[PDB]
Amino acid sequence: KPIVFSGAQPSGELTIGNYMGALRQWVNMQDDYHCIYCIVDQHAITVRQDAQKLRKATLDTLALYLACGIDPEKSTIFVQSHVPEHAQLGWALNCYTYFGELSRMTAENINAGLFDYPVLMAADILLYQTNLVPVGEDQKQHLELSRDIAQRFNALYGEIFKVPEPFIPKSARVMSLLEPTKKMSKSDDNRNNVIGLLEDPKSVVKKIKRAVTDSDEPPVVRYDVQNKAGVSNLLDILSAVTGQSIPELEKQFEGKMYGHLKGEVADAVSGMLTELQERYHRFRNDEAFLQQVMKDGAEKASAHASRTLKAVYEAIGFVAKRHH
Amino acid sequence: TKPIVFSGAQPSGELTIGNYMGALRQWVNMQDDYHCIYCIVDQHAITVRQDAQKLRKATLDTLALYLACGIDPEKSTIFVQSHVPEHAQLGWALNCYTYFGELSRMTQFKDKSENINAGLFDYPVLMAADILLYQTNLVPVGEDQKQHLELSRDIAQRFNALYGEIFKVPEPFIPKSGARVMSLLEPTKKMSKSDDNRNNVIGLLEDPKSVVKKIKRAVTDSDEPPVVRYDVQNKAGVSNLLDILSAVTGQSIPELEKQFEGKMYGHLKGEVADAVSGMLTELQERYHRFRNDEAFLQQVMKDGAEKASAHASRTLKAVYEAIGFVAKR
Numbered sequence A: 001k002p003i004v005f006s007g008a009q010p011s012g013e014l015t016i017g018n019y020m021g022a023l024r025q026w027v028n029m030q031d032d033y034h035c036i037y038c039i040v041d042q043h044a045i046t047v048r049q050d051a052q053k054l055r056k057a058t059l060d061t062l063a064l065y066l067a068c069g070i071d072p073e074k075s076t077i078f079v080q081s082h083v084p085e086h087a088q089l090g091w092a093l094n095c096y097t098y099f100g101e102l103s104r105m106t107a108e109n110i111n112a113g114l115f116d117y118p119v120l121m122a123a124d125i126l127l128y129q130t131n132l133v134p135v136g137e138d139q140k141q142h143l144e145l146s147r148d149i150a151q152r153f154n155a156l157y158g159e160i161f162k163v164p165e166p167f168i169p170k171s172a173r174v175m176s177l178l179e180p181t182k183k184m185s186k187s188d189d190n191r192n193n194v195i196g197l198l199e200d201p202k203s204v205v206k207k208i209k210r211a212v213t214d215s216d217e218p219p220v221v222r223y224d225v226q227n228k229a230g231v232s233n234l235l236d237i238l239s240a241v242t243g244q245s246i247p248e249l250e251k252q253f254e255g256k257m258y259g260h261l262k263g264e265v266a267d268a269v270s271g272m273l274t275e276l277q278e279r280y281h282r283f284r285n286d287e288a289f290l291q292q293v294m295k296d297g298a299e300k301a302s303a304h305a306s307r308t309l310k311a312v313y314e315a316i317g318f319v320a321k322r323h324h
Numbered sequence B: 001t002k003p004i005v006f007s008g009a010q011p012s013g014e015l016t017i018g019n020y021m022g023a024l025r026q027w028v029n030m031q032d033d034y035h036c037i038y039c040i041v042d043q044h045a046i047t048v049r050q051d052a053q054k055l056r057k058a059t060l061d062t063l064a065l066y067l068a069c070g071i072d073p074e075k076s077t078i079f080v081q082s083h084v085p086e087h088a089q090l091g092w093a094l095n096c097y098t099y100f101g102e103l104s105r106m107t108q109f110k111d112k113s114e115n116i117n118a119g120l121f122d123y124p125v126l127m128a129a130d131i132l133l134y135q136t137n138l139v140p141v142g143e144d145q146k147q148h149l150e151l152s153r154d155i156a157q158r159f160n161a162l163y164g165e166i167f168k169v170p171e172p173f174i175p176k177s178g179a180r181v182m183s184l185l186e187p188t189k190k191m192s193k194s195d196d197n198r199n200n201v202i203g204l205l206e207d208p209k210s211v212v213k214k215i216k217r218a219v220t221d222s223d224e225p226p227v228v229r230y231d232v233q234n235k236a237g238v239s240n241l242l243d244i245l246s247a248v249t250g251q252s253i254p255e256l257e258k259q260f261e262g263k264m265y266g267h268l269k270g271e272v273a274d275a276v277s278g279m280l281t282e283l284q285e286r287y288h289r290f291r292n293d294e295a296f297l298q299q300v301m302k303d304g305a306e307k308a309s310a311h312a313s314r315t316l317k318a319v320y321e322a323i324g325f326v327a328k329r
């Protein structure tokens, strides 16, 4: 099976765009690939965090990924800081990364971590002999650096690393509720644009009801991204939840207004979210289960990570560690 | 418990008399008075590109040389940096509490700057992690590491202010003489352990006969008559020789100045060559005994890494608890 590596930020509150797009897709491909999910708490501290919130957010992220359907028996899920090999390889790879490359990544009051984290990101991927990396547009420059580091290192010492590839195929279109041209992003400043995975029925209704549509006369529920971005976004969201086709939904809403569309979308999204929240709260409230998931995952990751690091360390020419 | 001493040296190039006077000499003398931990910093060495076989050999060379200088494994903890994962772990964490401007302003980074890698830029942060891991009180180094040591104090204070008494704020221990030994043919420049011109340097593993010839050819000055007195502006070479003689013998500069009244640079150089040649002969005798005893070197690295890991993990656990990571179970 090809190895897939995904970094999960313990800070990003996931939206329905994250779930119905990328996540639900990957939950269904756990028997096709050897998937690795890394909760990146060492990346998170590049921005200053409240200590207690970061600890909570780490566990919130673990429970939500399990709630979405990540299976710790099939996939490997773990906390980044629990595996020392990431930092160990991170430093080694600093020495085979040009300063110019990090300065070219798109002044003196910035912390060194925020400047230097793309090297740790490269080490995260290269530790596990990774074949595929699903990235957004924003993470593409980081993957190229990881690929350039791997090729540069292999040219000097032989075939130590796999040169990773991006996962090209896309999933599910979910746009922002008040700016349907812009995609629904977890990083969005305005939260009225997004529907979080842990939102209750009343909060979704309020946000869906206020979603921008259009001033067509008569009002007509038809798919058209150019001219009816808002109405089209609501149909896409409804299609993603229920599995019904857009033309099937256009037939369903024939002679119906936007208020009735918005009601069916709110009803459907909350039906999906309520099952996901049952799972979330059940996993999140069981500390013994979360501890056992983290131990097994870190144990799995560390076994594989140490094999690569030992080869990296042997190649560079360090004296081998004495054990007992 | 005793206050803690930590220091380290790179296994790259070949250690000089400069490295001995500014650091190793103080390391040997501190062993009973304080709890001493000394480290071979192979992770710092790879910031400059090494041959793989040369790096492995240089690590074991450096270990043997510590032992030959008088670093006793029964008194001090001696280990290889890469054998303790906690150095890289804390190093990353301290990156997030170090400003970019602090690293870009570094003298040592600018001088070292074809292969300008991120490790060379990020060098002082890992050095801070080396020191702060062991609750270090004193750091015996040469003058050229003063700026690096300032940053690890700043980092320690900055972190402690936010999270409490996690680190000790370390203090430099720079010697009165031999803190900055200068090049023999270029006494305005520091003696390096990777100088292209080898005649600038007195290697610790260099043939004493060859070392005596380098001292004889060391540049002095055009003063008429020749006078042996300390003056780094106008008499850099003579001052460097007086400084070397002071540090080997333990005698002060004014003591030596009186001793050389009415004498010239032939007497000065004869004394320096004699004192240094005798020290390196004895040092190299002990060296080959330790260096060829692989089982002894294997046991020192094992015991040292074990002692280091126990202490380093105590500090890292508290750092990780403070910053808000979920603890490893």
Ligand SMILES: Nc1ncnc2c1ncn2[C@@H]1O[C@H](COP(=O)(O)OC(=O)[C@@H](N)Cc2c[nH]c3ccccc23)[C@@H](O)[C@H]1O
Pocket: B006, B007, B008, B009, B010, B011, B017, B018, B019, B020, B021, B022, B023, B041, B044, B126, B127, B130, B131, B139, B140, B141, B142, B143, B144, B145, B178, B179, B180, B181, B182, B190, B191, B192
């Ligand atoms: N010409 C000279 N005259 C007098 N002293 C000198 C001369 N050249 C070097 N030194 C001193 O020798 C020690 C080793 O330096 P390295 O370059 O091996 O290695 C270095 O420059 C350190 N960054 C290694 C290190 C890494 N982590 C640490 C933590 C604590 C202390 C030291 C370290 C140093 O103390 C240095 O000040």
Ligand SMILES: COc1ccc2nc[nH]c2c1
Pocket: A086, A087, A088, A089, A090, A091, A092, A094, A116, A117, A119, A120, B087, B088, B089, B090, B091, B092, B095, B122, B125, B126
């Ligand atoms: C890029 O990752 C790393 C890893 C360990 C480190 N220690 C100091 N800087 C570091 C950077």
